Ligand binder design. Structure first.
Ligand SMILES: [Cl-]
Lengths: 317, 317
């Protein structure tokens, strides 16, 4: 509690005041009902959307449905084929969408001078595991196969995301390597979930009072994962991978008071020791979700900028 | 090993071609004589110097001599007071100077949109320990207390350096912290030496054949460190510090085949554990000194950009 930043404590205080005021916790609601309510809050939680050069909306055929996408063209960039980040929003594979991370994607685009393409994958409980990560993989594969159609440089096609979306990005890289196909050139992991098989110290220590609670994580899990599923499944627990060689250069960010902190850092450790170019950063005194809670948390904007800057430097923009 | 990048292999081959070609190795020359020869090579080893807005040369009164400096004003900024990186060149406190790292500082300035001030501290064997670091500390203190005359924003004053210069930057932060003084807002540690008391696994594994050899390190040591100096001295071994709290946000970079790799990463680890905002990156398959050997190693240019981008994003430029 002592290492908590004033802006972080302030937001938590506001949240606590709201709950005691009468605002129902998300885990007490039906998933579809709760989703609609919290997604609007997530939208309002972002900073004002910065202007970009161009925003495109469309969809393509996924494995079992249409997958909607949104492309963001960075200001000042005139090239036809841009280095491109495929972005997967967070929300426990249950909530969130393109709109909940729209401002964040906009800023990432401008700051990195890379195109950003946000993906609207299928959500649980309507489409449980492995449907969401299947869409994520299909989305990368489709955009890769049709890079020029998406205004993308196929040699510099990155994947990334926050939390659950960070997990998805991480799994996409592993899935491609294991399949023996060309994978992403870069992975941007923003406090990703990497281990569903065991509880780290941060998972236990930050179970309550830090926005992302254990009760909420259980609420997510009950919709995402069917009864009796192997928790060591690499699509659920990419951290447990036996081989980390052959994975793309990485940016891995954690938050100091995030339950997912330790397993994020451990994922970075595996990449480093495998000889993969890896950039790891921890933002102390902030919480899970700060990357897109940028109406309340300045640290999130700083994290946006560093992540974009590192990717931008990697791709030489 | 097999993880060596092709550009890294080519440079190492050029060096051993020159050695058996007749070129005497640095550790077989008197320090003064060897310095003149290697500095020219260090200058030539840099990429072509990019244009900047303005270059200033001057000096101020140090503890025991005049300390020369070079200010680099970044292109496109043109504000009165800029976020500033105080930079200390590398060379084992024996060789190197402002000229050997000129092109690098220029790129750092432009990419980060921060002013860079390169410090020409006293060198061994003419001025052994603790003279070189004493100048480094005095350089920061003087600029900090005279920020406006150095065109610097006092609230955004960083220190940084490569190798020996990286060590200096780290020590400056500890010194100010321990003295209760206002220290740097940021530290950029490019493969720093952090532990002179023990030989890490990387120090043993990469002791020979990777540009920075054990023979060269011992050659630096005899000029720099006087007889029976306590090797656990924190000015020689900042990694051994018992307290890491109160230190500024950091960028720590290591190279995959650097003897100093392990202790560099350990220092970042200590910072992370202590709750300091810390960005760590390892560049696998490249060597010690690649950050400024940018005529031969393009990885160095990427390293320049990442370091600059991280500092820029931290300072909000
Ligand atoms: Cl339900």
């Amino acid at each position: 509690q002592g290492m908590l930043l004033p802006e972080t404590r302030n937001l938590l205080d506001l949240m606590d005041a709201a709950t005691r005021g009468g605002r129902p916790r998300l885990e007490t609601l039906p998933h579809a009902v709760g989703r609609k309510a919290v997604d609007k809050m997530s939208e309002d939680g972002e900073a004002d959307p910065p202007e970009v050069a161009e925003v495109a909306n469309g969809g393509f055929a996924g494995p079992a449905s249409e997958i909607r996408f949104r492309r963001y063209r960075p200001l000042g960039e005139a090239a036809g084929l841009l280095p491109t980040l495929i972005y997967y929003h967070g929300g426990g594979f249950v909530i969130g969408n393109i709109e909940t991370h729209d401002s964040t994607c906009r800023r990432l685009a401008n700051k990195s001078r890379c195109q950003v393409i946000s993906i609207d994958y299928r959500l649980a409980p309507e489409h449980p595991f492995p449907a969401p990560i299947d869409d994520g993989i299909a989305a990368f594969r489709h955009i890769r196969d049709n890079a020029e159609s998406f205004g993308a440089d196929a040699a510099r096609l990155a994947v990334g995301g926050d939390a659950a979306g960070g997990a998805m990005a991480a799994v996409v890289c592993q899935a491609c390597r294991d399949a023996g196909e060309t994978g992403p050139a870069f992975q941007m992991l923003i406090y990703p979930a990497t281990d569903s098989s065991r509880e780290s110290a941060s998972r236990v220590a930050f179970a309550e009072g830090y926005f992302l609670s254990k009760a909420l994580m259980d609420w997510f899990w009950e919709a995402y994962v069917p009864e009796d599923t192997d928790l060591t499944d690499l699509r659920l627990s990419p951290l447990l991978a036996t081989d980390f060689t052959g994975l793309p250069p990485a940016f891995v960010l954690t938050a100091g008071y995030d339950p997912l902190r330790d397993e994020g850092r451990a994922y970075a450790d595996r990449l480093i020791e495998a000889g993969i170019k890896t950039t790891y950063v921890n933002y102390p005194g902030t919480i899970h979700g700060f990357f897109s809670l940028t109406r309340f948390l300045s640290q999130g904007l700083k994290a946006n900028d560093e992540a974009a800057a590192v990717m931008g430097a990697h791709f030489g923009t």
